[PDB]
């Protein structure tokens, strides 16, 4: 293991193998309390966001929202083998909220579809 | 979108389409810290309750507890089309803990039953 953020300079593919290392490190006188609470609030906001998308229990969560190409026109090898996550975050920053909005709509439709499928005797 | 609580006066059916709006707005010196910690405790208590029921990753969670009629004798059209959630919450207040207890018991059986099903070679 490379340790916390040791994969930051690695490729996105290789870096995807260390997600639990950072996951452990998001959680582990007034200033100490306030920072502990802030860390909790950031953790919960990200977990709550994953829950909205139906990804509450997964670190790698596949979705049903297609990639629109305009967001990034790179091939799979260009992204996963020739780039780091820092470069990707910069490249995709302007479209992050768009993607998040689409993910929310997809899960909402999925919940209705599940609700209807479970109502067929 | 109608915005935060904009569906409060809408019918329960219509209001069921905006669950993510309120969910997002549940998270988004001593006094500041006490209030934000309290918001976290309420969020976590509700998430824990959904977890106990097996609803940890869903906003619309379909369970296996039958409706006992005594709780409310209205049919589906009278409830989902002719009422708001505030009216329902008032009508079902005296039975809320009964339903919650049943939900807990139902999930416990399912977990034990799943544990047994996974023990069959």
């Amino acid at each position: 293991s490379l340790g916390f953020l040791g994969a930051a300079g690695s490729t996105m593919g290789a870096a995807s193998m260390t997600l639990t290392v950072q996951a452990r490190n998001l959680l582990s006188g007034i200033k100490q309390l306030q920072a502990r609470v802030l860390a909790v609030e950031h953790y919960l906001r990200d977990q709550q966001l994953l829950g909205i998308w139906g990804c509450s229990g997964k670190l790698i969560c596949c979705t049903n929202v297609p990639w629109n190409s305009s967001w990034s026109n790179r091939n799979l090898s260009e992204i996963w083998d020739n780039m780091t996550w820092l470069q990707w975050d910069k490249e995709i920053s302007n479209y992050t909220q768009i993607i998040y909005g689409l993910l929310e709509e997809s899960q909402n439709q999925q919940e209705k579809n599940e609700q209807d499928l479970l109502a067929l005797d | 979108s109608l915005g935060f609580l904009g569906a409060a006066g809408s019918t329960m059916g219509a209001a069921s389409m905006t669950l993510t709006v309120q969910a997002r707005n549940l998270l988004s010196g001593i006094k500041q810290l006490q209030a934000r910690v309290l918001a976290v405790e309420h969020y976590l208590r509700d998430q824990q309750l959904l977890g106990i029921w097996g609803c940890s990753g869903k906003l619309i969670c379909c369970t296996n507890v039958p409706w006992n009629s005594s709780w409310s004798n209205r049919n589906l059209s009278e409830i989902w089309d002719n009422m708001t959630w505030l009216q329902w919450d008032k009508e079902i207040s005296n039975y809320t803990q009964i339903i919650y207890g049943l939900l807990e018991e139902s999930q416990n059986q399912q977990e034990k039953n799943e544990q047994d099903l996974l023990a069959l070679d």
């Epitope: 579809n113 609700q115 209807d116 499928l117 479970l118 005797d121 | 059916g13 049919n75």
Partner: antibody
């Protein structure tokens, strides 16, 4: 007061692909599930395909599952069935019908409460 | 398909029963049956839905029931305007949604 009017041609070559559509009025279009049911000229009724009220879920009989697509547009109040392969056993009057499913927040259907006149396809 | 008699008959005013027989996986297990009245040249109209329910606009003369795997339609007070091909249907399941029987020609003597 409720009307369902099927539109489309009635004769296509084998191996051709045809499309049927149905316009409807007299009710809120988006509140009901719909289906297509067919009847060969000398046979009884056969259910062909069903679509939900929102259009996200579709179901087909196995004999047409890989060749028919059912879709709806709730802003134009239109339900369309696109047929592919169109093998002969598929000559029938195709009826537009309302019902057969509900949203789980509505009473059970499992019946067809309104029918159109039917597009005869040979 | 469902089993349904090819034809029935009777005089005006007579009570006529049209049977429909399925299997345990469809009409037996599920209480979701229906009956349709198809006059020649017209689309079928719904006469019965559910085991014992009737759409608004349908005369009280049309009724039905289910016992075991056998469902039936009974028309009391038979009129000349009731001469038609009748069909039974039932919900079968999530894999197969609806199953229809053949038609029964009801003729008025």
């Amino acid at each position: 007061e409720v009307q369902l009017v099927e539109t489309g041609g009635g004769l296509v070559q084998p191996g051709g692909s045809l499309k049927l559509s149905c316009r409807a009025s007299g009710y809120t279009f988006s509140s009901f599930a719909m289906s297509w049911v067919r009847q060969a000229p000398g046979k009884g009724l056969e259910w062909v395909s069903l679509i939900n009220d929102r259009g996200g879920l579709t179901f087909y009989v196995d004999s047409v599952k890989g060749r028919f697509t059912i879709s709806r547009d709730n802003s134009k109040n239109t339900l369309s069935l696109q047929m592919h392969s169109l093998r002969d056993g598929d000559t029938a009057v195709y009826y537009c019908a309302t019902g057969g499913m509900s949203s789980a927040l509505q009473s059970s259907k499992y019946y067809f409460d309104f029918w159109g006149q039917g597009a005869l396809v040979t | 398909a469902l089993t349904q008699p090819p034809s029935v008959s009777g005089s005006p005013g007579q009570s006529v029963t049209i049977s429909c027989t399925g299997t345990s996986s469809d009409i037996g297990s599920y209480n979701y049956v229906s009956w349709y009245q198809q006059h020649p040249g017209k689309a079928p109209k719904l006469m019965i839905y559910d085991v014992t329910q009737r759409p608004s606009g349908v005369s009280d003369r049309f009724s039905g029931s289910k016992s075991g795997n056998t469902a039936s339609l009974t028309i009391s007070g038979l009129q000349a305007d009731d001469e038609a091909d009748y069909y039974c249907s039932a919900y079968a399941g999530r894999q197969t949604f609806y199953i229809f029987g053949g038609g029964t020609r009801l003729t008025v003597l």
